[model samples]
Target chain A: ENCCVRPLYIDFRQDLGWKWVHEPKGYYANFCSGPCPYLRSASASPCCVPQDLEPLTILYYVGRTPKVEQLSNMVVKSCKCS
Target chain B: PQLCKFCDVRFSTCDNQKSCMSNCSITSICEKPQEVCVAVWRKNDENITLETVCHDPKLPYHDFILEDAASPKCIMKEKKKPGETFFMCSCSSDECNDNIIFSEEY
Candidate 1:
């Protein structure tokens, strides 16, 4: 199969723990999983990886009080052959 | 040869928070060929923070919107959070992060 970027939804509460995640319970964090393209003339082969990314703002409880935070480079906006 | 404004500062309060807009210096250069300029603005209950630097589009550490980077202007991209405001944007130009534009939408 050809290399490509795929979407993978992730929930902080489910993945991390029950005590975490207040706002935006889940989102499409995305993942890159595929094979690399063949390079006939090149010695090194490039692998598939994230080309673009976006931030996700999260609100979670930090001891009963809700705290706001931003996760930088949290979501993969796109994938490319790197 | 890509260049970007570089600075990181935080304000105790949002009031009179113009330091981030003027405290930046455009003497930073991107070491990576695919690096782009980035700007981050954040406001919480106690402080407001601003940061600018060169970033790799593939591995951005700050919350940056790649699509908005093409606008030639540092437009704020809102990241919803409880009782707080977070904005970030990226661009590909020389010293593009020096000025950021605030809109009514976000």
Candidate 2:
């Protein structure tokens, strides 16, 4: 069930059912990166909720090469449901 | 001058909105005596990440990282799976973690 009534805390770096790819047809396609199963390690997959899921106090950071030195600059100003 | 510095990393990709989801550059001052700047790199399949943060030397993880300390070095490499790798390192200078290249992605 992709239904989590409450807000879920997810890592911004996680593939929220999105990823970068070079399509043979010419245009960049956005598809499910893969199934990000939860793990025990804190550094495992960062955190992310699927578009089917949601967040309450989300601080999102998006870029081609997100740097560790500047996470404070990538706070998700608005958190909403998909 | 401060005792050390601070930095962090988060991964994200927006639905293309005008939000704070861009630019990953950071700089700050540290406020502890034995604290040091750290640069961490991780690769799990194609998900590669880089980060720099101020870590206290007393922590078990930090202690494990510094068990064989060196200046601007690659401390350890642990391969979790056939294509997963983790690297943690630390240095004692200003903005010295600008380059954290590993010999292999493992």
Candidate 3:
């Protein structure tokens, strides 16, 4: 099978234990999963991983403090067989 | 596209005299396109180690470390113990892990 990236919905409040202070409590985060092509002469084995990413800004609280934070490279925009 | 220095060496036990630092001269192009180069430094009573590799910022712990790795420069975090220290940094450019700056807390 060939490797590729796919999208998966994620909820910060439910998935990460973060208390949301803003609307739209979830997002579609990309994920890379599958089998990489095998080469006889390749020096190393490649695995699936994110090839691109984007930032997501959200207001949430991990503790008593609530603040807006931009998660840089938090969303996987694409994937590849690495 | 990203290339990173890939090597793991311990200052005290490595057989190659110039292995720990110079070994990083050999680099690998990251298989993941947007991956960042990472450098980790650890020191203990027995040995000091340097390890460099490619990393995906979206992985676990990214929420806590992403801000530091997002910076243009690599900076080692503060010491973890009286005699032991562990530091890590990540950057987007090629071979960015080759150099690391000591944080003021050190």
Candidate 4:
């Protein structure tokens, strides 16, 4: 929404396992702890999908037994004087 | 058929109130509709990671819109200097990155 900056989409649904099995319509199948079968390419690609796909615990993985979902409706634009 | 726009991906790893948040929009799509929808947030005091996905901008780290952004793939934010107290932002539309407002005091 800021105006324009095309190509950036990463939607990993079905419980941070990238589950969403609808068959190659958008593609996603990673069971955390790093790579299992992640796919998406026809445009947007600068990937970094790690909710728990551990790349060395992604700065040392913490504990919560998969209970993370609170960054709510991203909204920011009112601080420009750099 | 170049109208990539679908979002709602989840990532979480930063807790103590916001306890490692995560959620996903079932069937996140982007076949090539000019794909653009990314949100990322990372805090520090121990942990704080938030991320949404999808962005192509022809790679190059999207480098603030290839270093010549006159609004080319807009919605860009980069904070550093203890600015925003910890930041990382990117956006386009659709789920528009869901949410991020990490402010500990300017």
Identify the candidate with maximal TM-score. Answer: 1
For model 3, the stretches where C-alpha displacement exceeds 4 angstroms are: A1-82, B9-23, B61-66, B79-83, B104-106
lDDT of 4 by residue, B1-106 (tens): 2111223323355444421223433324454555554555555565545555555556544244423222223232445535233344444544444444333213
Q: Where does candidate 1 stray beyond 4 Å?
A: A1-82, B9-22, B63-65, B104-106
Per-residue lDDT value at A49 in model 1: 86
Question: Tens digit of lDDT per residue, candidate 2, span B1-106?
Answer: 2222234654423221222112334433454556566665566655655566656656655235444233543333443445655666666664444444344323
Tens digit per residue, CA lDDT, model 1, A1-82: 7666688888765775432345787888887778876763334677788988899997753222346889899999877776
lDDT of 4 by residue, A1-82 (tens): 1222223233434334433233322322222121222444433323333232211111110111122232322222111111
Look at candidate 3 and give me any clashing residue pairs. Answer: none
Q: What TM-score would chain B receive for each of the candidates shown?
A: 0.76, 0.60, 0.72, 0.30
Local lDDT at B14 for model 3: 28
TM-score of 1: 0.47
Evaluated against the true structure, the overall lDDT of model 4 is: 0.36
lDDT of 1 by residue, B33-54 (tens): 7777787777887777787777
Output DockQ, candidate 3.
Answer: 0.01
B1-106: candidate 3 lDDT, tens digit per residue: 5656656443523222221332454355566776777777767777777777777787743233544657665666643556676667777765676766665323
On lDDT, the candidate that comes out on top is 1
DockQ of 1: 0.01
User: Which stretches of model 4 miss by more than 4 angstroms?
Assistant: A1-19, A22-82, B1-21, B25-27, B31-39, B42-51, B59-106
**For this target, which candidate reaches the highest DockQ against the unseen true structure?**
4
